[PDB]
């Protein structure tokens, strides 16, 4: 059987409408994409032994990203504009894992992602650590691709 996919190589591509060039930014800690369907349980009168689950509404999670405090990229300059309320532009994000050669084995492809939260790491006098800042986006739809679905 083919070997499963490990989780320490990944590219992320962003495409805003403010910014003319699509840019690719390296992260440390992409959190993880959930997708819940939100059923509800109904209880019938004469039926006491089975359950009844009724499908309603697909809920998508959130894209939480982590990287170090490095030079100003086109994405930390873009969260600065949205969190100062100077723009409300959102982007189409493409996230993909890479195998041993270079090849994309799975792709996640988020749509209309909106920057909603910046979170700075701690400043501590005895710490021995890189200052990590936490970024967080809310998207509208999600569409996973690739050969390793």
């Amino acid at each position: 059987m083919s070997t499963p996919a490990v989780s320490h190589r990944f590219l992320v591509n962003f495409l805003f409408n403010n910014i003319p060039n699509p840019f690719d930014i390296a992260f440390q800690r992409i959190s993880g994409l959930s997708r819940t369907l939100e059923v509800s349980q109904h209880r019938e009168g004469g039926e006491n032994v089975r359950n009844l689950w009724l499908a309603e509404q697909v809920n998508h999670g959130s894209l939480v990203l982590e990287r170090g405090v490095m030079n100003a990229s086109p994405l930390t300059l873009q969260f600065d504009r949205v969190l100062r309320r100077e723009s409300t532009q959102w982007a189409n994000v493409v996230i993909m894992l890479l195998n041993e050669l270079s090849l994309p084995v799975t792709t996640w492809t988020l749509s209309h992602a909106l920057p909603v939260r910046w979170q700075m790491g701690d400043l501590d006098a005895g710490s021995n650590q890189v200052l990590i800042n936490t970024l967080e986006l809310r998207y509208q739809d999600m569409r996973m691709l690739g050969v390793k679905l």
């Binding site: 009168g45 004469g46 039926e47 006491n48």
Partner: protein, 57 residues
């Protein structure tokens, strides 16, 4: 001992049954009744309690 007697007379102002469980053919087999009554005693008992307080001697 009800209000001052060993019984509570009266008529039913209100009643509400709310069946909550059933069966496959729906024999109900759970009820939760919510009674509510009024006082309405008889006239012989009310006249007897009156003569026990100041019977005009």
């Amino acid at each position: 001992r009800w209000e001052n007697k060993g019984w509570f007379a009266g008529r039913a102002r209100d009643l509400s049954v709310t069946y909550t469980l059933f069966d496959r053919d729906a024999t109900p087999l759970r009820a939760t009744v919510q009674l509510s009554l009024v006082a309405d005693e008889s006239f012989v008992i009310q006249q007897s309690l009156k003569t026990q307080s100041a019977p005009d001697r």
